[PDB]
Design a protein around this ligand. Structure first.
Ligand SMILES: [Mn+2]
Ligand SMILES: [Mn+2]
Lengths: 495, 488
């Protein structure tokens, strides 16, 4: 049975409010969350994180922030559409929404905003350089089966010991979790353990995009593959994630019903904006682009969504660029938003369950239009040398930075712990200074996770390392494209 | 009589919608406006326009954009508060709001967002360098009375009343006035009248020469619009039911949010730039209050937030922000409702937080601390001075286009390639196509025959230049300065 009272959890993890609360009181909690998000430095960082194009000396181009604001307004429209349609169906009171109208909407907007929140400096390329650097040092493939006589792992504790141990399973999970860094998973890690925001369960639900644990190694459940497409959370969050499922009434590997709305907007905004920027960076004319889109459609009919959207917007522009993109955007939303709004309502039971193994804008006419934009963007924009140059640049910056911090990892627990207590250590001065370079928040978080472990435990050293790596990963992922590059040069000694 | 149906004008200037429209249809028009604003490049430019502190290699510091988002959430709260209070008073249906709930709120947020949108690269300092550069070339003081035997104006053409108005308008550039110019004539957004009302902060015309309006002193504190907009501005007044020099009732809400967000954010950034500790700051605030009582708003806000803190800094600012809004927002929400007739009239000669209000005092306290410690910092001041030269120098680089005859200038507008003026050609190409387009359009609307026609051309010519510059980000203007000075 569909009841949103049960999904829109206004309680918190720590210092949580409890007992009754009016429609207004509840609105205020959700409005509190907005203020928390909007004033966050993690949200400010996004104006300095690159979105497709390099951070040029004129802000004409979209950054991760300006894009996420655009995504949020799309999300607002979809949510608002779902609501209006449902009030016309009178199912609003029936689904326990008549009083959670505003909250619903705000959650969407705020999750929209926070997509890309945990992404590393150089995005998907950052992810690569991180995962790759860890892979050459851990080799999680060497953990999959029985203890290999020749384990490629550089860490003594994480190397599968031959002797009959269930500790071998702990090593397996750590190796896969650290080598499978994902922005969404880092986003969850960020809002809770790092940024220490203390948001409503419902909000944190909306930013939980995937249900796959980072430590996952096998084949994906056939009836869960879509939902477990990448990883959604780390081993460090597993505890809190369980807490989240129970609070939001979610089964293992079940998604929060609103996440689907936020996802949709992101999928829409996704290309069109970069395509606008492409003509702005003079890659081709607006006319040239129209012809690339005509070429891309192929199977042309005079009543298709191409004619209704792209052909339509092209005619509006002639008796230019502004008008073109302005109406192209309009045209798209005006057809796509209703579709996804409907799709949501249509498949609401499975969505409420968070079991629905599909996207609002599927694969089989809306999905086609999007794909068309994507193809054009791939073949002409994403392929541009200045883009690719920066993509490759990013990779080295992160890889090199990770190597600069290798000495802290290439250490014994006894030594590392020593550095954590005494800030000034005799024999390890480089390591000292390098550890000071780390941000006070990720540093704090490490210690806290460590102090919660049992000293006596044989798993304790493995955990320390898992956390040690997490700590390093947090520092790096936390950086902006600029800061990471600047630091790379500074630590390579060229400034 | 108070009816918001009459103030929340969902019609547009060009391609305007008309006839009935449902609550939903109306919401959609206001939601359309949001999309227009949010996708605007003029709104993107703000992530590259400096807010107090220089850009820095880490975005830990607020930019004009990140501040305006903060302002918008404050505005949201105030608007939402006014509404909730009014629903409790049941006056919502009574004031024609029961169906314009969402719109009201969106307008606030969108106007909040668009405050500073018309600000130049080096904001306040940019204004100076512009106005100063024009003043040495026009001397509008020399126009005030009778034609001076020794007129300091560099322009032959600068009917005596038209000359007066042009000189004052061009020499009195203001971000808010430029903002109005921007959304309509430059950005060609075509927004709902109501939205454009919300960004009209001042009722003073830029061409005004005759110190202080007595009865309308506060509303005409700074200029609100240019001579180039006077026509459209008249159109706006009539559409929004405003008397000459009357303000849009919602503008007051947006304004308030800005007055609040104004300092606290830079104070957070001050501790972030290590200017002083969070502890050092608390002591500067204790020093600043002086007249200490154990139940005052200082104790309730600052003392309160200080105790909560004992990350420390995060918690401190987080709850300090909370504490402030939790007391100030209700006040301004009330003030609005309390003085609603005069606000609806847009005649109310005061601010929501203004009088001897404990609220106004708290704000002033933040401001004083910011002035005495943050705004006074050398790296700030250095950049402020730097900005001035960049703009002044840039204005001088473009002096050749102004130091020209109409006959010559016009020639350059038709033929892109002109023989004798090659520097001027290339310099004119440097200007953005939008401001270029806008100039021509304003010019083509004038009567060729008219004796005022040459004066207008110049007014517009200067406006065109001003648009280019004001349109730039701190970075682009600096980059260009160096590029045109030949150091890259
Ligand atoms: Mn996105
Ligand atoms: Mn401001």
């Amino acid at each position: 049975q569909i009841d949103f009272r049960k999904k829109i959890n206004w309680h918190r993890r720590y210092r949580s409010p409890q007992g009754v609360k009016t429609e207004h009181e509840i609105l205020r909690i959700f409005e509190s969350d907005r203020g928390r998000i909007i004033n966050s430095p993690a949200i400010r960082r996004l104006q300095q994180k690159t979105q497709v194009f390099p951070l040029e000396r004129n802000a004409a181009v979209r950054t991760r922030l300006t894009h996420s604001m655009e995504v949020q307004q799309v999300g607002r429209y979809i949510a608002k559409e779902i609501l209006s349609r449902l009030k016309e169906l009178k199912l609003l009171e029936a689904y326990g929404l008549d009083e959670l109208t505003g909250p619903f909407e705000s959650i969407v907007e705020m999750s929209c905003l926070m997509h890309d929140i945990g992404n590393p400096p150089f995005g998907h390329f950052g992810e690569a350089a991180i995962n790759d650097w860890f892979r050459q040092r851990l080799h999680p493939e060497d953990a999959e089966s029985q203890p290999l006589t020749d384990d490629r792992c550089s860490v003594a504790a994480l190397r599968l010991r031959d002797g009959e141990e269930p500790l071998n399973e702990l090593r397996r999970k750590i190796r896969q979790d650290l080598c499978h860094f994902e922005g969404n998973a880092q986003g969850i890690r960020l809002v809770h353990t790092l940024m220490r925001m203390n948001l409503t369960w419902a909000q944190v639900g909306g930013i939980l995009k995937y249900t796959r644990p980072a430590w996952w190694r096998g084949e994906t459940p056939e009836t869960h593959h879509y939902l477990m497409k990448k990883p959604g959370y780390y081993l460090s969050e597993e505890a809190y994630i369980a807490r989240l499922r129970k609070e939001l009434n979610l089964a293992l590997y079940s998604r929060f019903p609103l996440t689907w709305i936020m996802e949709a907007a992101d999928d829409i905004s996704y290309c069109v904006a970069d395509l606008e920027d492409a003509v702005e960076k003079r890659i081709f004319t607006v006319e040239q682009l129209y012809h690339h889109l005509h070429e891309a459609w192929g199977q042309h009919e005079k009543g298709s969504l191409f004619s209704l959207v792209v052909e339509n917007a092209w005619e509006k522009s002639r008796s230019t660029e502004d008008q073109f993109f302005m109406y192209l955007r309009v045209n798209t939303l005006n057809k796509l938003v209703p579709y996804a709004a409907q799709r949501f309502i249509d498949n609401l039971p499975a969505i409420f369950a968070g079991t629905f193994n599909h996207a609002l804008l599927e694969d089989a006419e809306c999905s086609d239009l999007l794909k068309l934009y994507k193809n054009v963007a791939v073949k002409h924009v994403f392929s541009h040398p200045d883009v690719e140059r920066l993509e490759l640049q990013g990779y080295r910056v992160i890889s090199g930075l990770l190597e600069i911090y290798r000495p802290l990892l290439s250490l014994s627990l006894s030594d590392f712990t020593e550095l954590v207590e005494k800030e000034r250590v005799k024999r390890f001065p480089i390591e000292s200074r390098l550890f000071h370079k780390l941000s006070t928040r990720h540093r704090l978080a490490y210690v806290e996770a460590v102090s919660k472990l049992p000293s006596d435990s044989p798993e304790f050293p493995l955990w320390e390392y898992y956390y040690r790596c997490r700590l390093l990963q947090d520092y790096i992922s936390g950086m902006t494209d600029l800061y990471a590059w600047d630091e790379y040069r500074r630590l390579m000694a060229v400034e």
